[PDB]
Amino acid sequence: NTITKTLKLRIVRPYNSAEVEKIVADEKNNREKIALEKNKDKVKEACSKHLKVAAYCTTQVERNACLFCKARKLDDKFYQKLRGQFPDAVFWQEISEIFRQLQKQAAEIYNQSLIELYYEIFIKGKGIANASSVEHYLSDVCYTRAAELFKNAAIASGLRSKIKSNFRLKELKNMKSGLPTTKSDNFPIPLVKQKGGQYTGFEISNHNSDFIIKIPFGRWQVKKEIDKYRPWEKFDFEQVQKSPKPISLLLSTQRRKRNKGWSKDEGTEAEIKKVMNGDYQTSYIEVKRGSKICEKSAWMLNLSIDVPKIDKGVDPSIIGGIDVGVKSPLVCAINNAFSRYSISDNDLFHFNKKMFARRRILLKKNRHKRAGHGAKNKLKPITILTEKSERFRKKLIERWACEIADFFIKNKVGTVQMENLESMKRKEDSYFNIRLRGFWPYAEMQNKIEFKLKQYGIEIRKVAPNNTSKTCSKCGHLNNYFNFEYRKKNKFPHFKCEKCNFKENADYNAALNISNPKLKST
Amino acid sequence: TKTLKLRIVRPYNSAEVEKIVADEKNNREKIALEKNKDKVKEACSKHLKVAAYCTTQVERNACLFCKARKLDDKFYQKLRGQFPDAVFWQEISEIFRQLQKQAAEIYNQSLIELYYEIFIKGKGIANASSVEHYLSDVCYTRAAELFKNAAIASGLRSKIKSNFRLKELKNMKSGLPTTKSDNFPIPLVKQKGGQYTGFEISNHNSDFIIKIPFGRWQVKKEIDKYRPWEKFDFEQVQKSPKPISLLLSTQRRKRNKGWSKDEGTEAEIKKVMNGDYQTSYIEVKRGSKICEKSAWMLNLSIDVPKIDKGVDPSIIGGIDVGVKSPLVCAINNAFSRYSISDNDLFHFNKKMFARRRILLKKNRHKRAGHGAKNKLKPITILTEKSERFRKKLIERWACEIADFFIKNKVGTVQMENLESMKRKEDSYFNIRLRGFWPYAEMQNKIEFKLKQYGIEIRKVAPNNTSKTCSKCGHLNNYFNFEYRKKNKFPHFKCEKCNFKENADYNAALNISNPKLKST
DNA sequence: CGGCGACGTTGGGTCAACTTAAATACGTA
DNA sequence: TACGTATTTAAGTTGACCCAA
RNA sequence: CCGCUUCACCAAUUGAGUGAAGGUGGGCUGCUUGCAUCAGCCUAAUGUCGAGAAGUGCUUUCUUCGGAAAGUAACCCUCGAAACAAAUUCAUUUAGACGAAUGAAGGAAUGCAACAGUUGACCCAACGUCGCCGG
DNA sequence: CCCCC
Ligand SMILES: [Zn+2]
Ligand SMILES: [Zn+2]
Ligand SMILES: [Zn+2]
Ligand SMILES: [Zn+2]
């Protein structure tokens, strides 16, 4: 009945108190008054918003070239004054050292507690374990070690949920996988705090149109003798019941207030307005690093969120279908309505070929290229393009999914059937393996279209894919001549029926056969 | 160490049982012949010559005779009733799967119990003596009492001792490598040194016979319901010996196509039987390639000493410029080319010409009042940095070329002469980069990097290369440069020899010929 | 530049699982 | 006793491949 | 210059061809992302280096199968290093110039389109060396 | 056993 999501927000700064933030806001307003009175007709770069409240000038500038906006920025002498004046305040050096230490010890506890679970279940408990015995062993092992290190209960139960997400019991009993280990460096901090029924969850306050989140935390004390092999470990984290000290964080919604739908009811901005209202409680929080934005890393925060379904006036008596192809990207059909949709944008397949070709050039003769300073340094140009290509892929798939969903909602289509495609991964074909496997995300496309349709109350039926491209959509003749080897050697032609003389596209015919409700779901 | 992987098509029973099986395939072929007096017309790929009366050919795979020549399960079942010692591919597939799952279980649980005893209950203070104590007191004894072979026990103990990396696990650079019990190999250590030749491998008609000593495998009197895969017992080696003989083939699929003979392992197996190359490690594992996942493949690991050759002056190499790549290397009697790629040069030049086109456009109005001198400040430095880039690129190319000639064991490289190198319309330079290249610095750094490694240079300077073929000295004069430009730079096709190869490589071959004297 | 066998790094496909719920110490109103 | 927030705890097996080029 | 875009042409979509115009033809920051534009900047960047010693390797010593110590630094060894703006401080030549730091706290666009994210497992592919076989 | 080059 509810659909789970995450919101990704950027941490502006740690929020501190109400008196220290009153001092910060008044120092910003004092600098604004100082620059608003010292620039007495000396400058004329008042920004369009700054003309209204107080300025006496003519022209409008881009808000980057304002001088009263520029003066509101606080320097480092004010923050060493505030660290001296309020020594119980919370600033970024403590916070970034805590967050990096949390990340590294959460990865270490994840590894050691999965190995300890494998011991207690399979070596000590002789393999005898149900699923509820895995629930007991998770809360008895992973929570207990994580709460023996971090005396938070939020981090310890978040690490229990992170180990629970990746511990598969019968796959490790039947030896169908290896035991999971982390090698990652940006491992999240998983941070559950319960939200059902009589609980609220993490206590998001909205002070002056801001996104303040509060993290229940202990009183950190710097280690006396810091270890020289592991110098990131320099805090102690007392118990949250003995001596609490909750880290509040301000989260970046200033850019999102300029976005086109913030005064709407459906986007990511309406979800953030609802979380700001006190609707849409969150029970899950992940803190990760972003990219190194000017030699100091950005920290992002993911708010898991449970969202209802939207009405849209959409009924399951109208049935649609989607044919996932590599030549033609995505073609949507309706069962009886003579309506049709066909993607025509830039393609993810051509983009994957281009990125693979460039990656082949850059890897092609590495031995003297940038040698001598490690594996990470050596493969630096490719990874910078891998982040950008993953972002471009994801945004292209999401734009295709919104075009598909806008088509299907415009025709009031309630059930979209799709192909099963659970057997494609097992294919022994050399061509598929070497030329089509890693460059054609059919299932990531399918999952994002299931997600986008599921947000609107549209059901998705995985429909068995046998003889779908060759059966005719008018009179279901099952043209057996229209095999894949004939679709190959005829250079992938239109569909021609043998007893109807029916002529439509090969990707639209299989879209209108996928749309048929008679086929058995799988 | 070299690991040579073979297939297993079937076990080798004995002389008499394999005689009965081969006579049964011949008798089924004879009965399928005499019941079909030209009913169907498949005729096999070549059985048409020996004994068939049928019209057209088939690929041997859609024939009628082979699907009768493929035996039936019940025949092997009545043979297993009639012969108690004959081993077949269903029973030994069960034994291989159960031994794979057992050894993977012992390996996984021994790594996790090592990690527990060392890093969790033992607070991270544990030398390798505690690892050797755990192995020889717990894991070797467990593997020597579950399956009583000392080969699989001392192979599992060695695979865990080598695969448990204490120095990399103490500092948490890595985690534990745990497997999937289909990718796990069954180790089977025996000695290499002197007395033990190792597993007593013999030969067949383009096949091999490996005689692993093993046990008797009485079936369990009551299968354990909660572990249903463990259905054998593995009685001891010295009490009831029953050595498995397997039949090993070199055939592999050409990416799921027909069987090609792999001669790269086959030569090494010939060196095994001839008396040298004593083997010491026979792993059994499932196949990893496509259309081989249900095939049991047998890796012979064999140890060779790290012995260099040096360079020998009989091998003669050559460097010549190309038209799509700046430098092509070649050896006369081998294939062995090494074409230096263009893309980093091309993209450096693309960015340098973009910076030139920009700094010569936004100087006419901005840089003004002081003359052209104000304009000239930026370019002098960009081209200086470009020359330093070209110098580092030429040093990288010299490193690549010298690594190529050391790996391919070349002792004397013959380069074209300097003025004959630069006066060339068949170069990548003078077509794209109009003149801007240090040929003298390039040749001096290639000469110095090669003379660092004890390789001579010769300066042969041919009269007319880039159209003379190598296999015959034809002087194919139809290679005009103006012909090459209009025909989109085509390959080298010999007229009388029909030798199809690259136009860069045969031109790199005519420099490497020793029949033309130094100049 | 093609195969074949190891080891190593990476990228990048599918797929699975998480984003729970009841009870209780410790403290306060 | 009502409420809040941080803390802890929930239990027991049961393969899989289907082939002698 | 373009293995850059568009238009016109020729030969048979490749030319890494002819002509005219235009443009980083590679990136960074602009407050979650993508594309285009805009302001500023870097660019030898598919580059060149710094510091180290946990590991692979290598040398020496030791009961020396195992393994440990010390060192060397080849490594697809570890960590890093270009790129918006206001502010602050110092040195040096004659208000200006250079070197140059300490750093986060909403100082930074416009338009269109979006905005579940993380962890792990399995598999395939590319590449690097290391050996064998063939034309 | 087809869905996809
Ligand atoms: Zn302003
Ligand atoms: Zn029809
Ligand atoms: Zn025959
Ligand atoms: Zn010839």
Q: What is the DSSP string of B353-398?
A: HHHHHHHTTTTSSSS-SS-HHHHTTTHHHHHHHHHHHHHHHHHHHH
Do A325 and A428 lie in a common domain?
Answer: yes
Distance CA A157, CA A151 (A): 11
> Chain D bases under 7 Å from protein CB?
4-21
Distance CA A283, CA A268 (A): 18
Distance CA B277, CA B298 (A): 17
Directed axis angle between helix B89-115 and helix B150-163, to 10°?
40
Residue from the list B120, B226, B343 with its beta carbon closest to the beta carbon of A116: B120
Could A365 and B400 be called an inter-chain contact, meaning their C-beta atoms sit closer than 8 Å? yes
Distance CA A169, CA A130 (A): 9
3-state secondary structure of A251: strand
Breakpoints of chain A, after residues (C–N > 2.5 Å): none
The H-assigned helical ranges of A167-312 are: 169-173, 268-277
The residue of chain B nearest to residue A427, with distances taken between CA atoms, is: B290
Domain of residue A499, CATH code: 3.30.420.140
Domain count, chain A: 3
Q: Which ligand is nearest to the CA of B499?
A: 4
Do A397 and A501 lie in a common domain?
Answer: yes
Residue at which a domain ends, from A85, A113, A134: A85
**Is B226 contained in some domain?**
yes
Breakpoints of chain B, after residues (C–N > 2.5 Å): none
Q: What is the dihedral of CA B46, B47, B52, B57, to 10 degrees?
A: -40
In DSSP notation, B433-477 reads B-S---HHHHHHHHHHHHHHTT-EEE----SS-SSS-SSS----T
**Closest Cα partner for B21 from B104, B64, B80, B93?**
B80
Closest-CA distance of chain A to residue B260, Å: 16
Distance CA A449, CA A398 (A): 8
Question: In a 10 Å sphere around its CB, with 0-12 CB exposed, 13-18 middle and 19+ buried, how is residue A160 labelled?
Answer: buried
Q: Amino acid letter at A435?
A: R
Distance between Cα B496 and ligand 4 center (Å): 6
Summary count for chain A: helices (H), strands (E): 16, 12
Do A338 and A391 lie in a common domain?
Answer: yes
**Cβ distance A42 to A68 under 8 Å?**
no
Could A179 and B176 be called an inter-chain contact, meaning their C-beta atoms sit closer than 8 Å? yes
Distance CA A6, CA A283 (A): 11
For chain B, how far is it from start to end, CA to CA, in angstroms? 45
Instruction: Extract long-range pairs of A21-24: CB within 8 Å, 24+ residues apart.
Output: A21/A207, A23/A82, A24/A74, A24/A82
Do A386 and A477 lie in a common domain?
Answer: yes
Q: Amino acid letter at A388?
A: K
Residues of A in contact with B112 (CB under 8 A): 115, 118-119, 122-123, 179
Do B261 and B409 lie in a common domain?
Answer: no
**Is B39 contained in some domain?**
no
**Is A199 contained in some domain?**
no
Residue A509 CB in 7 A reach of strand F: no
**Cβ distance A420 to A463 under 8 Å?**
yes
Do A420 and A494 lie in a common domain?
Answer: yes
**Cβ distance A248 to A309 under 8 Å?**
no
Do B254 and B337 lie in a common domain?
Answer: no
**Is B111 contained in some domain?**
yes
Give me the phi and psi of A100, to 5 degrees please: -70, -40
Residue at which a domain ends, from A118, A145, A173: A173
Residue at which a domain ends, from B307, B337, B357: B307
How many pairs of residues across A and B have Cβ atoms under 8 Å apart? Answer: 70
Could A115 and B120 be called an inter-chain contact, meaning their C-beta atoms sit closer than 8 Å? yes
Domain of residue B408, CATH code: 3.30.420
Q: Which residues of A are catalytic?
A: 323, 419, 487, 507
Instruction: Extract long-range pairs of A125-133: CB within 8 Å, 24+ residues apart.
Output: A127/A173, A127/B226, A129/A169, A131/A169
Do A414 and A465 lie in a common domain?
Answer: yes
**Closest Cα partner for B511 from B322, B324, B326, B341?**
B322
Could A428 and B172 be called an inter-chain contact, meaning their C-beta atoms sit closer than 8 Å? no
> Chain C bases under 7 Å from protein CB?
1, 3-6, 9-23, 26
**Is B205 contained in some domain?**
yes
Could B290 and A177 be called an inter-chain contact, meaning their C-beta atoms sit closer than 8 Å? no
Six-digit token string for A270: 């309406």
Give me the phi and psi of A98, to 5 degrees please: -65, -45
**Closest Cα partner for A515 from A339, A313, A347?**
A339
Six-digit token string for A106: 């959460």
Burial B163-173 (b: 16+ CB within 10 A, else e): ebeeeebeebe
What Rg do the C-alpha atoms of chain B give, in angstroms? Answer: 33
**Is B376 contained in some domain?**
no
Distance between Cα B466 and ligand 4 center (Å): 13
Task: Count Cβ atoms below 10 Å from residue B53 Cβ, excluding itself.
Answer: 11
Do B203 and B156 lie in a common domain?
Answer: yes
Task: Count Cβ atoms below 10 Å from residue A294 Cβ, excluding itself.
Answer: 6
- What range defines the domain where residue B412 resides? 316-345+402-509
Six-digit token string for B78: 């009545």
Residue A199 CB in 7 A reach of strand F: no
Distance CA B273, CA B209 (A): 11
**Kind and range of the H or E run holding A211:** strand A211-215
3-state secondary structure of B404: helix
Could A367 and B400 be called an inter-chain contact, meaning their C-beta atoms sit closer than 8 Å? yes
> Chain E bases under 7 Å from protein CB?
1-4, 14-17, 23-35, 38-39, 43-52, 54-56, 58, 66-68, 74-88, 102-135
Task: Count Cβ atoms below 10 Å from residue B131 Cβ, excluding itself.
Answer: 17
Distance CA A13, CA A371 (A): 39
3-state secondary structure of A308: coil
Q: Amino acid letter at B107?
A: Y
Cβ-based neighbours of A498, under 8 Å, separated by 6 or more: A477, A479, A481
Task: Count Cβ atoms below 10 Å from residue B64 Cβ, excluding itself.
Answer: 19
Cα B229 → chain centroid: 35
Residues of B in contact with A123 (CB under 8 A): 109, 112-113, 116
Where do we find the tokens 């890393």? Answer: A297
Distance CA B478, CA B494 (A): 11
Do A35 and A134 lie in a common domain?
Answer: no
**Is A238 contained in some domain?**
no
Do B299 and B445 lie in a common domain?
Answer: no
Nucleotide E51's nearest residue (CA vs C1') is A373
Alpha-carbon distances of A351 from A327, A331, A356, A390, B182, rounded to whole Å = 13, 19, 8, 11, 36
Give me the phi and psi of B502, to 5 degrees please: -70, 145
Method used to obtain the model: cryo-EM
Alpha-carbon distances of A435 from A421, A427, A429, A432, A439, rounded to whole Å = 18, 13, 10, 6, 8
Distance CA A415, CA A409 (A): 11
Largest distance between two CA atoms of chain B: 109
Q: Amino acid letter at A471?
A: T
For chain A, how far is it from start to end, CA to CA, in angstroms? 22
Closest-CA distance of chain B to residue A428, Å: 6
- Separation between the CA of B339 and the C1’ of E46 (whole angstroms): 17
DSSP B119: I
Do B116 and B237 lie in a common domain?
Answer: yes
Residues with CB under 5 A from ligand 2 (ion): A 472, 475, 477, 497, 499-500
Residues of B in contact with A435 (CB under 8 A): none
**Is A322 contained in some domain?**
yes
Distance CA B94, CA B232 (A): 9
